Design an enzyme around this catalytic site. Structure first.
Site, PDB file in Angstrom:
ATOM      1  N   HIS A 162       0.738  -1.211   0.052  1.00 43.96           N
ATOM      2  CA  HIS A 162      -0.040  -0.052   0.016  1.00 43.96           C
ATOM      3  C   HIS A 162       0.845   1.119   0.015  1.00 43.96           C
ATOM      4  O   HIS A 162       0.274   2.424  -0.122  1.00 43.96           O
ATOM      5  CB  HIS A 162      -0.864   0.017   1.188  1.00 43.96           C
ATOM      6  CG  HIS A 162      -2.294  -0.991   0.962  1.00 43.96           C
ATOM      7  ND1 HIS A 162      -2.590  -1.194  -0.101  1.00 43.96           N
ATOM      8  CD2 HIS A 162      -2.692  -1.668   1.853  1.00 43.96           C
ATOM      9  CE1 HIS A 162      -3.816  -2.163  -0.018  1.00 43.96           C
ATOM     10  NE2 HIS A 162      -3.677  -2.311   1.354  1.00 43.96           N
ATOM     11  N   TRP A 164      -5.686 -17.450   5.467  1.00 40.82           N
ATOM     12  CA  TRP A 164      -5.186 -17.963   4.022  1.00 40.82           C
ATOM     13  C   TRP A 164      -4.635 -19.404   4.188  1.00 40.82           C
ATOM     14  O   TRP A 164      -5.398 -20.399   3.975  1.00 40.82           O
ATOM     15  CB  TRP A 164      -4.514 -17.256   3.147  1.00 40.82           C
ATOM     16  CG  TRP A 164      -5.366 -16.119   2.699  1.00 40.82           C
ATOM     17  CD1 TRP A 164      -6.417 -16.324   1.636  1.00 40.82           C
ATOM     18  CD2 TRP A 164      -5.323 -14.618   2.817  1.00 40.82           C
ATOM     19  NE1 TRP A 164      -6.847 -15.183   1.257  1.00 40.82           N
ATOM     20  CE2 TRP A 164      -6.186 -14.219   1.941  1.00 40.82           C
ATOM     21  CE3 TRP A 164      -4.640 -13.842   3.683  1.00 40.82           C
ATOM     22  CZ2 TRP A 164      -6.513 -12.881   1.955  1.00 40.82           C
ATOM     23  CZ3 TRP A 164      -4.668 -12.607   3.746  1.00 40.82           C
ATOM     24  CH2 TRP A 164      -5.915 -11.900   3.148  1.00 40.82           C
TER      25      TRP A 164
HETATM   26  C1  HEM Z   1      -6.149  -7.523  -5.834  1.00 40.60           C
HETATM   27  C2  HEM Z   1      -5.011  -7.486  -4.948  1.00 40.60           C
HETATM   28  C3  HEM Z   1      -5.375  -7.350  -3.269  1.00 40.60           C
HETATM   29  C4  HEM Z   1      -6.394  -7.567  -2.711  1.00 40.60           C
HETATM   30  C5  HEM Z   1      -7.928  -7.741  -3.272  1.00 40.60           C
HETATM   31  C6  HEM Z   1      -6.288  -7.362  -1.161  1.00 40.60           C
HETATM   32  C7  HEM Z   1      -6.911  -7.689  -0.134  1.00 40.60           C
HETATM   33  C8  HEM Z   1      -6.568  -7.678   1.286  1.00 40.60           C
HETATM   34  C9  HEM Z   1      -7.399  -7.012   2.305  1.00 40.60           C
HETATM   35  C10 HEM Z   1      -8.866  -7.009   2.041  1.00 40.60           C
HETATM   36  C11 HEM Z   1      -6.577  -7.506   3.233  1.00 40.60           C
HETATM   37  C12 HEM Z   1      -7.129  -6.833   4.745  1.00 40.60           C
HETATM   38  C13 HEM Z   1      -6.267  -5.950   5.290  1.00 40.60           C
HETATM   39  C14 HEM Z   1      -6.112  -6.487   6.676  1.00 40.60           C
HETATM   40  O1  HEM Z   1      -6.822  -7.186   7.327  1.00 40.60           O
HETATM   41  O2  HEM Z   1      -5.256  -5.745   7.699  1.00 40.60           O
HETATM   42  C15 HEM Z   1      -5.161  -7.805   3.011  1.00 40.60           C
HETATM   43  C16 HEM Z   1      -4.185  -8.083   3.657  1.00 40.60           C
HETATM   44  C17 HEM Z   1      -2.956  -8.480   3.306  1.00 40.60           C
HETATM   45  N1  HEM Z   1      -2.453  -8.118   2.119  1.00 40.60           N
HETATM   46 FE1  HEM Z   1      -3.696  -7.423   0.421  1.00 40.60          FE
HETATM   47  N2  HEM Z   1      -4.674  -7.057  -1.297  1.00 40.60           N
HETATM   48  C18 HEM Z   1      -4.314  -7.061  -2.523  1.00 40.60           C
HETATM   49  C19 HEM Z   1      -3.018  -7.052  -2.745  1.00 40.60           C
HETATM   50  C20 HEM Z   1      -2.089  -7.571  -2.095  1.00 40.60           C
HETATM   51  C21 HEM Z   1      -0.420  -7.542  -2.386  1.00 40.60           C
HETATM   52  C22 HEM Z   1       0.043  -7.384  -3.968  1.00 40.60           C
HETATM   53  C23 HEM Z   1       0.283  -8.184  -1.464  1.00 40.60           C
HETATM   54  C24 HEM Z   1       1.497  -8.341  -1.141  1.00 40.60           C
HETATM   55  C25 HEM Z   1       2.574  -8.209  -2.147  1.00 40.60           C
HETATM   56  C26 HEM Z   1      -0.789  -8.314  -0.328  1.00 40.60           C
HETATM   57  C27 HEM Z   1      -0.466  -8.768   0.860  1.00 40.60           C
HETATM   58  C28 HEM Z   1      -1.398  -8.769   2.071  1.00 40.60           C
HETATM   59  C29 HEM Z   1      -0.884  -9.093   3.182  1.00 40.60           C
HETATM   60  C30 HEM Z   1       0.427  -9.730   3.527  1.00 40.60           C
HETATM   61  C31 HEM Z   1      -1.948  -8.814   4.064  1.00 40.60           C
HETATM   62  C32 HEM Z   1      -1.977  -9.596   5.527  1.00 40.60           C
HETATM   63  C33 HEM Z   1      -1.606  -8.325   6.479  1.00 40.60           C
HETATM   64  C34 HEM Z   1      -1.564  -8.736   7.662  1.00 40.60           C
HETATM   65  O3  HEM Z   1      -2.252  -9.813   8.081  1.00 40.60           O
HETATM   66  O4  HEM Z   1      -1.460  -8.018   8.599  1.00 40.60           O
HETATM   67  N3  HEM Z   1      -1.956  -7.921  -0.855  1.00 40.60           N
HETATM   68  N4  HEM Z   1      -5.361  -7.732   1.667  1.00 40.60           N
END
Ligand code: HEM
Ligand code: HEM
Lengths: 700, 697
Positions: B83, B282
């Site tokens: 982000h 996941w």
């Molecule tokens: C279409 C693309 C994506 C969608 C729909 C998406 C969706 C989401 C959403 C809704 C969350 C919840 C946020 C939270 O609970 O803190 C999340 C967390 C996360 N996203 Fe994404 N995201 C996208 C792209 C990415 C990309 C490109 C990466 C890494 C290169 C990524 C890595 C992560 C990780 C590691 C988390 C977990 C964060 C945590 O557990 O603290 N996401 N994602």
């Protein structure tokens, strides 16, 4: 919601957000003159005689795109000057002609500065023939003054020195979000002083008089000046009116581009001259509206007035029974007209206060000239500052009691060895560090970089209008510090004469040196001498009744009548002092740790050991092991609840902002590093030297 | 309407007022470090071997005011980089990681960057130990890249250099005035996780993701690399309905110290915090690398159910996997879950092939995700000459606007005069040299520093064919003459191509100044090379085509605003300033630098002669203006007696209308300022021609 180049950014998502754009307005990048240009060194080299011999020329050639009334422009230029230095409101200080803001602002569109864009465009030949050696504000105002001179007069004088700024200044002009809708001065939104047709379009002389007096009072003009100013002004030139005032086009901010940045392009008739419309009134005041004489008052006492309407759709007065029908010459050739007067200006005949000072002006018709010259010269050079900036060879020599007269140095300026001697003599039997700074700061916080009035110079910090200020706790120890400083002054003099303000700033310097040395750095604050002491008779007690800050964050004190929340006032006060974004944060940290707190409260302090100039305010603020929760007594304070459940710190609303507003969070996130100590104390001394030398204009 | 420190003037009275406060942004006054502080020099001393030995420690220690799932923050950091480098918009060039705008902006309040404002605080014990030798942006995206490596992964590399800023840049994020271009829903950085527009159907999620990522250079195979490779780590805090969360950070009561989303539900943090409103976990080991995501993604067939927060999320049928996912804080395991956007990779036909192919050997997934992540991070930095620190993977790349290494012997100004001589003693005319040079240095965007005069791409296919550089005109002739000169010069220390381009430009400025009477010496710094046609891709350059190069008075089709603004938005990219913008516009207008031979705008009677005649002839009030009877956005400078003498456009008369710029034109339009004007023009020009010269500055 909209693109950034049109508006955009944030603030489209948050109504009241602490906008940090006001601190660094007028940057050095947008200065087309360059980064090494000194206006004071240039404006002295123009041949004001040649300039006077040129502006007199442009005031006679009726330009074909805006005809000249009676073949002369003087009236228009006087009006330009007046509307250029008639925005100066003392309640905060911003505005005035000190920045020539009339060019670009909401100013060049107020529904009163109409037919003034043409007035500025008239002056283009002179500025063109001179170049960078004539700032626009100086040209406008001096053109007005030289016009007044050319139309038969003996003026008090004039002085160059006003500098131009190349970005609009953001000043609060009114809550009303539409034209003609305590920190204000214009009774309407867009007006300058008074609705020409009486307050709220109501042509009543008594209300007009009450309002005109209550307006001029917010620009430090007495009752004799106001009458003099109005009479002497409107003894010149005519009005402008023809058909209905609704025919005028848009204003020079929402106008089409083919108008080359003008406005009010009237479609009625040829659009200019004999049919030009601007204010919607059609009045000729004198009977020779192009040269000075005591005649306006005669017409003010010559005919009895009765209300009527206007051929342009407005209110005005007119002599009854057709008295003098056809006795005033046409502005462009034609049969005579009827002697008419505006709505407000009849107040000078009915109001009992002004009557005593106007009826005296029928006989003794000469006293009007000198009083008007004085009031005019006051209205002009009001926002230039101390006497040492009046460059050019037209400034008079005599001082006026409003200029904040500071007597010239009448002794040898102190030496460097004497500086160290005074340091040793002041840090050995003086007082604590928390005192030598608080009084010193208070002596340099009355400054206002809006009009450069007040400050450290003059040593007014020990006179009546400032000692009694509750912000410098009078029943505290300030008087003791004053006694100590005066006695060490006279002792060293009995042991090259050092003034008082010199020694006040020296005490502040020695205190900062003491704190820095206690912090582990042999650093020195640069001190330049060159200040003098003022006397009670040369400093008006009532004039300074406005400098008393109603809200001063750097000492953590808020008073009553505060307009905005207690936070925004910190930036406001930090905007007058002309402090950049970093120099505000570091200064806050320094004053907070040094104990420069109103009544020596334990607020703001974030250290277990005081009077030690360290970064302990910042490093301790960003710690997240503490929880902030509003105080239980609900006094606008907070409590540093630690992890053990014990109240540890106690900051005020002006402190926790430096850890919340995500922008200002950044600047603190630098001075709070582990190796920031060799930077903080070095970046602090710079800001302190910058504040203590704002009113040092004789040498800078 | 409101005070200046809180709202401001110059905006309420008129919304559509050309706001010049976007030019002087990021000034030299609001800089705490002060004046110089060469960031490219300081970071050359930090111990990345030690910084890694510290970010590794700040992650494993669970802070008491925000627990870590499974006692590890790696997840929350990986997302933070994403982000922070996901606000890129290829169609403009702004955003990106190289602005560090993750802090002060509307960025830190969007209802997508929720809970992330906590992450910026977990890193304070790291930056505090270094201070000025490691800015935020570098630190943010590093803690990103350095959390991967510490979690069973050999990434591709990393490089510092993203110098921070000290004031929120001005960006247009969309038209909607409420939360929920490049982003699909306002505030949501990318795709609304609960299906596009709240519609929970994967087939639409796929066609949305495709177009969305296609707005940030990512192909079709570099997409599934991210999502599959990005959601192998960590869970998603969403327990409890998203109705009790606090306000957004920019408008929160100060007792939170700038932290937003103070959840009142339960304890508020840990096993009960709320970030986006989805409870999904996941993999089966969400804190290390393994080919697990794809396994569960195909492990079962899915079905749509409700969330404990009130969102639409999926869960395997048949009731299998009961407890096969570890509890984030110890306890009963949940069922195998999944978002909505992930199911796209199972039902969409495009991603189906690559997804099926990644399940036979995941090493390809590792490599593809590595390269994709590297591209996602090091995109807002441009030329390879800016990467500092030891960890730079200096092998090569294709999307980095590559240039060969400066190999041949450079020039020592002993022959530069002869080149500046032969370019007029054997060449063309000034109205063509400055045109082609300025064109070759107009493909620049000070946001991400792509394009630029470097590389000599003015003679390659993607730039030679653009419309704004009229190919049927004479560009080919200028290029062929420059080539003949170059070949005739090296036979007797070899000189490249863009060398001669900008050098002929400077020498033509010199010729025009001589035609005015100011023997001024244009500065010039050698050391640029020409790239080949193979190393210059065509797909990533189709955006750099200027849609409205107001400097040249050219209006394409596709302008959201009139021409009067598309000059600023252009002159804001080149890192110009109002004085330099006015000066350069006047110079290019008087030197005959229109995209035709159009007399549209020329305010002189002897062209090819650098002078301030444009400015002085603009301001003369004796000349009236009115829209031409053709009604083609051209005005007709009518004199006083009824004759046509000047023809201007919207980009011209704006300097006569807008009151701010009027002061600048007044300054340069004097009579004792022509020396000042020509000198400042040379200075601003040398500023433009040397924007991308990063191998020296
Ligand atoms: C279409 C693309 C994506 C969608 C729909 C998406 C969706 C989401 C959403 C809704 C969350 C919840 C946020 C939270 O609970 O803190 C999340 C967390 C996360 N996203 Fe994404 N995201 C996208 C792209 C990415 C990309 C490109 C990466 C890494 C290169 C990524 C890595 C992560 C990780 C590691 C988390 C977990 C964060 C945590 O557990 O603290 N996401 N994602
Ligand atoms: C204090 C109350 C004042 C009021 C109510 C007032 C109102 C007006 C109005 C309505 C006009 C006519 C505008 C037009 O024709 O479009 C005017 C013009 C003028 N004002 Fe003022 N004004 C005031 C103060 C002053 C001052 C302080 C000065 C000079 C020091 C001044 C000097 C003039 C002159 C010379 C004109 C003639 C303009 C021309 O001939 O085109 N007025 N004023």
């Amino acid at each position: 919601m909209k693109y950034p180049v049109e508006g955009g950014g944030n603030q489209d998502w948050w109504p009241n957000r602490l906008n940090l754009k006001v601190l660094h307005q007028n940057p050095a990048v947008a200065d087309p003159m360059g980064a090494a240009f000194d206006y004071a060194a240039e404006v002295a080299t123009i041949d004001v005689d040649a300039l006077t011999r040129d502006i007199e020329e442009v005031m006679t050639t009726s330009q074909p795109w805006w005809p000249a009334d009676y073949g002369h422009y003087g009236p228009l230029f006087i009006r330009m000057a007046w509307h250029a230095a008639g925005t100066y409101r003392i309640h905060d200080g911003r505005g005035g002609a000190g920045g020539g803001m009339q060019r670009f602002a909401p100013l060049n569109s107020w529904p009163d500065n109409a037919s003034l864009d043409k007035a500025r465009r008239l002056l283009w030949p002179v500025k063109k023939k001179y170049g960078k050696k004539l700032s626009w504000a100086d040209l406008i105002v001096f053109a007005g003054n030289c016009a007044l001179e050319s139309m038969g007069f003996k003026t008090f004088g004039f002085g160059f020195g006003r500098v131009d700024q190349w970005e609009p200044d953001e000043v609060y002009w009114g809550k009303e979000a539409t034209w003609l809708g305590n920190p204000l001065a214009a009774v309407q939104m867009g007006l300058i002083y008074v609705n020409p047709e009486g307050p709220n379009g109501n042509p009543d002389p008594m209300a007009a008089a009450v309002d005109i007096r209550e307006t001029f009072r917010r620009m430090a003009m007495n009752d004799v000046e106001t009458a003099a100013l109005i009479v002497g002004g409107h003894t010149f030139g005519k009005t402008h009116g023809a058909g209905p005032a609704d025919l005028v086009g848009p204003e020079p901010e929402a106008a089409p581009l083919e108008q080359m940045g003008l406005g009010w392009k009237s479609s009625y008739g040829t659009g200019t001259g004999k049919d030009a419309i601007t204010s919607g009134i059609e009045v000729v005041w004198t009977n020779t509206p192009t040269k000075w004489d005591n005649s306006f008052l005669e017409i003010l006492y010559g005919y009895e007035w009765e209300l009527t309407k206007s051929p342009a759709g407005a209110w005005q007065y007119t002599a009854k029974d057709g008295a003098g029908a056809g006795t005033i010459p046409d502005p462009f050739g034609g049969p005579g007209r009827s002697p008419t007067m505006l709505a407000t200006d009849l107040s000078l005949r009915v109001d009992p206060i002004y009557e005593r000072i106007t009826r005296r002006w029928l006989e003794h018709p000469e006293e009007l000239a000198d009083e008007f010259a004085k009031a005019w010269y006051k209205l002009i050079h009001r926002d230039m500052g101390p006497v040492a900036r009046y460059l050019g060879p037209l400034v008079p020599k005599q001082t006026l009691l409003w200029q904040d007269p500071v007597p010239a140095v009448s002794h040898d300026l102190v030496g460097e060895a004497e500086i160290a001697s005074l340091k040793s003599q002041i840090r050995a039997s003086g007082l604590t560090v928390s005192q030598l700074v608080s009084t010193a700061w208070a002596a340099a916080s009355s400054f206002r970089g809006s009009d450069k009035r007040g400050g450290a110079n003059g040593g007014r910090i020990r006179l009546q209008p400032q000692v009694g200020w509750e912000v410098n706790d009078p029943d505290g120890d300030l008087r003791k510090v004053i006694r100590t400083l005066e006695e060490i002054q006279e002792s060293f003099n009995s042991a090259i004469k050092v003034s008082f303000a010199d020694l006040v700033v020296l005490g502040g310097c020695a205190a900062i040196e003491k704190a820095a040395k206690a912090a582990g750095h042999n650093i020195t604050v640069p001190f330049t001498p060159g200040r003098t002491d003022a006397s009670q008779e040369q400093t008006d007690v009532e004039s300074f009744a406005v400098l008393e800050p109603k809200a001063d964050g750097f000492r953590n004190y808020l008073g009553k009548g505060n307009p905005l929340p207690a936070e925004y006032m910190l930036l406001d006060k930090a905007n007058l002092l002309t402090l950049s974004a970093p120099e505000m944060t570091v200064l806050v940290g320094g004053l907070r740790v040094l104990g420069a707190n109103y009544k020596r409260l334990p607020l703001g302090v974030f250290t277990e050991a005081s009077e030690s100039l360290t970064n302990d305010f910042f490093v301790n603020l960003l710690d997240m092991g503490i929880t902030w929760e509003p105080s239980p007594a609900d006094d606008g304070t907070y409590q540093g609840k630690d992890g053990s459940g014990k109240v540890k710190w106690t900051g005020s609303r002006v402190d926790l902002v430096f850890g919340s507003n995500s922008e200002l969070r950044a600047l603190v996130e630098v001075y709070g590093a582990d190796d920031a100590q060799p930077k903080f104390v070095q970046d602090f001394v710079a800001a302190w030297d910058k504040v203590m030398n704002l009113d040092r204009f004789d040498v800078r």
